[PDB]
Ligand binder design. Structure first.
Ligand SMILES: Cc1cc(C(=O)Nc2ccncc2)on1
Ligand SMILES: [Cl-]
Ligand SMILES: [Mn+2]
Ligand SMILES: [Zn+2]
Length: 452
């Protein structure tokens, strides 16, 4: 009736030992958590990062949000101090329910959220903050500059400090030189009651990890990675407008979990409270809303486990003609080029992915040869701005190889879309390649050595 809450997602309480290494721990829980898409992690009670801030000096620009189910919204791109926002947000929740904010049951806000997003009689609109850390509004975790407490430095380089999550050596996005700005850096989220984030998966099917610093809880819904296409099909029918192609302007939407459960999509939920961690697994759809005033920090990340998924995702993007954030192949080769200083298990996994990359590339080069492309020249793709090296057809970011033509100066196609560049005859085409097969096999061999 009304709303049936989805079954709760797995909750984990690592001891200090298992908690010590984030990447170790995530790998342990992975067979469990990947069945539910999201999971929750409560740090040992000991572990308590000092969030220190002046609520008056931290300003940010509010984004505005209408609350209608199945209505398209864009993924994020006056002015509030954290205090004035806190005051607006508590006033709002308190007025909406005629109650003190911490006396509204979470059950109720959930019920009420889904009621007001379906009723287009109501048009409730809320505000929120979303931004990567900057000079006016910084990470809620300890960084490096002012002088820190003796305890603030304890957490200064914890693995669960989310600033450290990109740059760790068991992470893969780590050694990406390319400034994948929005991806490798933490986002900051200032919530109020009903402010929400629509159904989505992460760029390149990466993990994410989300930390609630303080404030009222955040409610999550999650779908395991294996049911992603099932969910997408359900959303194609009930809301086909979200799927019309787009030059960052992906459309995402709010949709009732019960609607998905009804169509046999497994959904899980949790309330994330202050000091708890939520982890989303690869290709795991999620959405949720805030119970009231709160502050969260989140970051994208990639493990060795993810590398094959990372390849599969880029293949998938190509079919969808969806833009890439970074070149998977460029990442692999950068790792191969630093094979000597690589973590050994990392090296073994890069090696297996390199092996696939190379044999696919061999085949693709044979194919474009038999299409009459004869001329060729090495090309340093990594020097090109990403928008200067997308396949004109499927929009994938080129790095291993591309086809150019003197007839269409500056355009490129991947080797899958040779026939889609221009109407000149094959001998006017040119294979632009980063590496010869002879350059590549030694790069892989260095990985095999480092892994033994
Ligand atoms: C509004 C609002 C959103 C959040 C938040 O946490 N959003 C999020 C976005 C993408 N993936 C996961 C979560 O907080 N306030
Ligand atoms: Cl509405
Ligand atoms: Mn997300
Ligand atoms: Zn292409």
């Amino acid at each position: 009736s009304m709303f049936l809450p989805p079954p709760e997602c797995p909750v984990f309480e690592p001891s200090w030992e298992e908690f010590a290494d984030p990447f170790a721990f995530i790998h342990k829980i992975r067979p469990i958590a990947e069945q539910t898409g999201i999971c929750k992690v409560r740090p040992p009670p000991d572990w308590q990062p000092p969030f220190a801030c002046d609520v008056d000096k931290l300003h940010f620009t509010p984004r505005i949000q209408r609350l209608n189910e199945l209505e398209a919204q864009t993924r994020v791109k006056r002015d509030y101090t954290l205090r004035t926002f806190g005051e607006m947000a508590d006033a709002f929740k308190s007025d909406y329910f005629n109650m003190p904010v911490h006396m509204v049951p979470t059950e109720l806000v959930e019920k009420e959220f889904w009621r007001l997003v379906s009723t287009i009689e109501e048009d409730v609109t809320v505000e929120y903050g979303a931004d990567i850390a900057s000079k006016e509004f910084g990470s809620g975790f300890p960084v490096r500059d002012i002088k820190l407490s003796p305890e603030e430095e304890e957490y200064l380089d914890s693995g669960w400090n989310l600033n450290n999550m990109p740059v760790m050596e068991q992470s893969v996005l780590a050694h990406i030189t390319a400034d994948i700005c929005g991806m490798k850096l933490p986002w900051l989220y200032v919530g109020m009651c009903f402010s929400s984030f629509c159904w989505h998966i992460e760029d390149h099917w990466s993990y994410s990890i989300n930390y609630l610093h303080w404030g009222e809880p955040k409610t999550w819904y999650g779908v395991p990675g294996y049911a992603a296409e099932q969910l997408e099909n359900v959303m194609k029918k009930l809301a086909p407008e979200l799927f019309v192609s787009q030059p960052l302007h992906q459309l995402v939407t709010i949709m009732n979990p019960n609607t998905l459960m009804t169509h046999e999509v497994p959904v899980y939920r949790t309330n994330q409270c202050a000091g708890e961690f939520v982890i989303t697994f690869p290709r795991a759809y999620h959405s949720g809303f805030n119970q009231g005033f709160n502050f969260a920090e989140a970051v994208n990340f990639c493990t060795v486990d993810w590398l094959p998924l990372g390849r599969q995702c880029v293949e998938h993007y190509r079919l969808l003609h969806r833009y890439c954030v970074f070149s998977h192949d460029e990442m692999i080769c950068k790792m191969a080029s630093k094979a000597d200083v690589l973590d050994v298990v990392v090296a073994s996994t890069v090696q297996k992915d390199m092996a696939i990359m190379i044999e696919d590339e061999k085949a693709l080069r044979e194919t474009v040869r038999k299409l009459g492309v004869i001329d060729s020249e090495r090309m340093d793709f990594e020097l090109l701005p990403d928008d200067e090296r997308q396949c004109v057809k499927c929009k994938t970011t080129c790095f291993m190889s591309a086809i150019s033509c003197s007839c269409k100066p500056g355009l490129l196609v991947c080797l899958h879309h040779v026939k889609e560049l221009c109407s000149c005859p094959p001998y006017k085409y040119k294979l632009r390649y980063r590496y010869t097969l002879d350059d590549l096999y030694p790069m892989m061999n260095a990985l095999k050595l480092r892994a033994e």
